[PDB]
Amino acid sequence: QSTANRTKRMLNIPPHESFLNVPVEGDRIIFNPPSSEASVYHTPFKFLPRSDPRRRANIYKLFDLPPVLYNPTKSYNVTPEQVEEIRELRAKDPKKYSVTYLSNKYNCTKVFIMMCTQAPREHQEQHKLARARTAENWGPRRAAAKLDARRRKEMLHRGEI
Amino acid sequence: NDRFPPLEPLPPAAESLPSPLPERALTSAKLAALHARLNLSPKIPLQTLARTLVDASADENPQFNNANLAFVGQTLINYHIAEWLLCKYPRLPQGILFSAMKAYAGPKPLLQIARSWGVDTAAVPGGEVDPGLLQFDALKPGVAITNFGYKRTELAYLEKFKWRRGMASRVVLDDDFGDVVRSDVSYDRYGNPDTRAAAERAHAYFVRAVVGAIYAHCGREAAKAFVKAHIMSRTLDIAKLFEFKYPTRELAALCAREDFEPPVARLLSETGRQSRTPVFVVGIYSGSDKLGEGAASSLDHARFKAAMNALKAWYLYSPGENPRVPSDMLEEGAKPWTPAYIDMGEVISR
C-alpha cells in the first residue's frame, strides 16, 4: 500500500474467537486450550513427585489410543555358555563368522553380538577402509548430501531440529 | 611544556608505581560515577571501589589488588547460584548443572556484566592511569585465583592420551564448574587467544571483587541482594543446554526405574508421507499417560524428538518460579523451613 498504516490493515488477522466473547458486569476466567505444541516445562502429572501439591484433575474437569509406531520386545535367547562360543568363533574367523551370521545363528540382534565380542583390530581397520573407499567414489553433489544427513542428526540431538 | 601543563598533577614517581595511590581515588570522576551507577551503599568508600579495579597482574602485592576481594565474592556468587538452581530445578543432571552455573557466574557472563556497568580498561597499568579504569596486563598469565579444587594425579594423561574422567569426581577435585585445576616488553603485536582469556578473566575478577567489597562493608544480606539483582536477574533457557545420546534408551530406563509402563511410541498425526517435507507427530505413552511428543520430518527422528522432550520434562521439573532458598533462614524473622524435594539422580543407561 501507500503507507504503513494501510499495509497493516490489509494484512490484519482477527483475534481468536475465544477472546471475542468478552464478559459483562464482572470479570471471568474461561478455558482456552490453544492449538499449539506445549513446552517441556508443562510437566505431565506422571512426572510430578507425590509431594507436589499442584497435582490435580485436568482443567476440563475443574470446570482407544492412537496407532502404535514402535513397541519393541526384549528377548534373551543366549546363555552364558553360548556367549563364549560367540567369542571363540568371532576371533577364530571374523570373515566367515560375521555378526550377521552369529546373530542369525543364536537368534539375537546384531548389536548384542557386538556387545559380547569385537573382531580383532586387523579386521576392524579393513571395515573402516571399505567404507572410506566407497566414500571417495561420491561426487560433490552426493558427498554434500551425505554430510547434511550427518549434521541434521547431530543438530536433532542438540535440540536444533 | 609551558604551553601544555599536566592536566592531573602527579609526582614524578607516579609512573613507577604499579597502580595509582588510594588517595587518588578521591579525585577521579569515573569512580564517583561508577559508585553511583551501581547504587552502592555510602558505606563503601571510593578507595575500596578503586581497589576492586586493580587486577593481580597489574599489582602483585596481596593488597592494592583484586585477589582477596574476588575470592570472597566468588564464594558468595557460586553459593547463591548453586542453591538457587537446586531449588528451582532439583532434577538437573550434574553436567547440565555445571553448565548452568558457568552460564551465570562464569567468565563469559561476568564479562557482559562488567561491560553492562560501563567499565573501560586501561591500555597498560601504572600509577598514572585513572583509578576508574580496570587495570590488568594480558601478557602475564602467571596469576591464578585460589579455588577449592585439587590437581588430578592423571592430569598429564587426561590431556595427552584422552583418559576418562568421571562426573562424580568433578564435585571434589575439579573447580566449581567442572573444569580441571591447573589446565623489555614490546607492544608491537596483535591480540591472541590467550590475551582474550586473560582479559575476560580480569573482568570476571572485578565483578567478583565488587560483591566481596559489599560483603565486607554492607554485610551478607546486601551481598545476596546484589547477586540477586545483577546475576540471577539474567535469562537463560536451560532446555537449550541438553544434548542427548540415545534418548530412547534413557527414557526406557527412566520408566523402568520409576516402575512406569514401558514407553510406547504412537503416531498422533501425520501428513505428507511420500513427500519432500513430511510431518510425523509421534507421542510416547506409558500406558495411557502421554509423556512427551515430537514432530519431525522422519519417523525415527520424530520418535527420538518425542523421547528427548519426555526426558526434558522430567529433568526440567520446577516446584516454582520463585522458590524459597535455604539461605532465607539466615535472615532472622523468617517462617519455618519446609523440606525441599531431593532427586535421586540422573538416569544411567546403555
Place this chain on the structure above:
Amino acid sequence: QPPISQQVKELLPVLAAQPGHYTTIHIHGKPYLVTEGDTVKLPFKMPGVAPGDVLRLNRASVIGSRDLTLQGAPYVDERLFECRAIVMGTESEPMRVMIKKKRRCRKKKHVFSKHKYTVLRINQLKINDVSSL
C-alpha cells in the same frame, strides 16, 4: 469494594500456578500484549518521566496463561494482579522528509518529522493470592 466472583476466586490459583503468564495492558487506551521482561516502545513521548522512574500499570483487559484466561468486562480488577514497569529512556527515529508536490508545479514543499518514543521495561507481572479477599 466490589467482591470478586466465586468463579474467579476458585480458578485464579490455577491460573497463577501455570508456568508462564501474559497480560494485555492499556496505556492511554491502546493495548500492549507483554510479559515479564519484555520491552515496550510507546509511539509517543510520555511527559514527566526520566530514565529510572517506576510505573504501576493498572488497566489490563486480559491476564491469561496457556490454558486459562482471565477477562475483565472493561478491565480486570487491580487487586488480582501487580504489573510494574520502569522507564528505560527515550529513543528517536531517523529524520524522514515528505515532499508535497503536484504535477506541473515546481514548488516542492518539505515536511521534516523526527518523533521521540518512550521505552519501558516490564519488570513485574504477577498474580496475587485472593484467598484473603
Place this chain on the structure above:
Amino acid sequence: MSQTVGATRLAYSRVWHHISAVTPHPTLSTIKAPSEAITPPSLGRLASRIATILMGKHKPIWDPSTDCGDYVVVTNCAGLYTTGHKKWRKTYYRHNTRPGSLQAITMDALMEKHGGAEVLRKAVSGMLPKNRLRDKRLARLKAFEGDAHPYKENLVRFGGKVVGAPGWEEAVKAIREADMERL
C-alpha cells in the same frame, strides 16, 4: 512479540487436505433443507474454498508474501456439480495474438478432453492473486476424476483416521483429552 517467539515449523508446513466433489456439503451448498436435498459444493463455490487453502488464508500466521499455502486433493471431479445449463452453454476462450485464431470450447467438451479436473483448475486459477505465486499455489491443487489418487498416504490424519473419514472427530477429541494431564 511473545506470541511469535517459538517454533514456527508446524505453522509453515504443507498440510494435505482432501475433499470429494460428490459428497454433499451442508456449508457450501445453497440448499439446506431437507437433508436429502443438500447438494455438493458447486464448481465456483468449491473453487473459492480451495483458493483460500492454497493461499493459506485459513492460517492465523498468514502473510501474502510468504507461500504458506497447503495442498488440496480433489477426487470425483467427473461428477463436478453445476447448476442451470453451465455444462453445455458455458464457453472457454483462448487467443494467441494472431487474428482469426480464437479457440472456443464448451464445458462439456472440455471435460471430454481433459476431464473435470481442468474445469476446476481454471476456476481456482482465476480466484488466486495475479502474481508470481499463482503457478506454485495452483500446482498444489491435486484434482482427479475418480476415487483413485497417489496421495492416499499423504492426507492428514489424527490417530490413523483421515480427516473426512467416518470417525476422525472421535480420534481427535481422544487425543486432546489425554493432553490436559500436565501443568
Place this chain on the structure above:
Amino acid sequence: TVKALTQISSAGRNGVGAFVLQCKKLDIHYSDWAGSSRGMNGFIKSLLPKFAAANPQIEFVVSPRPAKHPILMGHYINGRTKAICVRNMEPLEILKKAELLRDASGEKPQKFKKPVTSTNPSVRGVWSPYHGQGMAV
C-alpha cells in the same frame, strides 16, 4: 545419556532486578572566543552545576575547545557516542539538549515498527494445525 552444551550463556535485561543509566559520560566543550558559544558558557555557569548534581551516575568533563563550535558529546555503555552541536543556542536550549543525551541510548535511530520486543517464548505457544480440532475442507 545427557551431554551438557557449554556455549550458551545468560543474557542481561537492563531494568529487571536492577537499572543502569546508559549514559556514562558527558563531554561539554566550550570556547572563550567563539561567539557561537555565548550560550554554552552560560549553561556551564547557570544550569550545568545543578544538572550534574542531579545525575551522579554520569561523568561530566568540561574542557575548552577554542576555534570550534560548542558540542555535547555523550558516551554510552554500548560503546557509541552522540555529539550535538549547540552553536547559537541559549542556556535552556542546552539543558533540553543535555537531557536528550541522558534519556537516550547509544543505539542508532530506528523507525517505529513494533511496540513490544520480547525474547521469552509464547505463553500459548505458536499455532499448529496438528494440535487443534482439525479442519475439514
Place this chain on the structure above:
Amino acid sequence: QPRPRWSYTPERMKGPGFSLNLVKDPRRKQWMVNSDPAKLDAFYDAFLGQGGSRMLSEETKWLAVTHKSFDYGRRGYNTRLAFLGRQIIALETTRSILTSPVLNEPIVDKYGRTPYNHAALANIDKLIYTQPLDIMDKTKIARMGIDFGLLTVMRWKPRMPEDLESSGVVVVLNSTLFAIIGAISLEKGAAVAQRIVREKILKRLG
C-alpha cells in the same frame, strides 16, 4: 504399602542374569555393603550428635550415603548433594577465616606505599596468610569419616577391594561427607546446616 527405593532395585531395569564383560581377577567382584537401617542411624547420631538420625528423611539418609558406583546408579546417588555441600563448606570455611580474631604482621610494599588500612578490608586481608584449602584438605576430611565409621555404612563398589586408596576411597569419602551437609541444608535450611558445619566439621578439623 510401597517399598523403600534404597532397599531394592527396579525389576524391569535388570538384565539377563549374567555378566557380559570379562574380569581379570574374580576376587575383585566381591564387596559387601550395608543394608541395616540400625547401623546407618548409629553413624548419623555419632556424626551429627544425638538427634541426627531423625534430622534427615528415611529416603534421604540412604541417598546422601550412596555413591554413583553402587548398583550402576539404579538406586540414587549423592552427586548433586555433594555439589551443594561443597559450596556450603567452602562458604563457612571462608567466613571462619574472615571473622577469625587473629592479626599478623602486614606486608611491606616494595614501592613504600601504604595501604588503605580500612577495618572492613582487614578481615579480608586475613586470607593472605590462611587459605580455606589449607583446612578443607581431602586427607583431613576423608580421615574424619573413617573415624566416625563412615566406611562401614557407605554404599559403593571399589575399583579393587584389595586397594581402597587407588580405588578412590578419598574422593568417595569427601563426596559422601559433603552430601550429608548438602542434604541437611535443603531439608532443614542454612541455619541448621551452618550450625553443623561449624561444630561437626570445622571444630573437628581445627
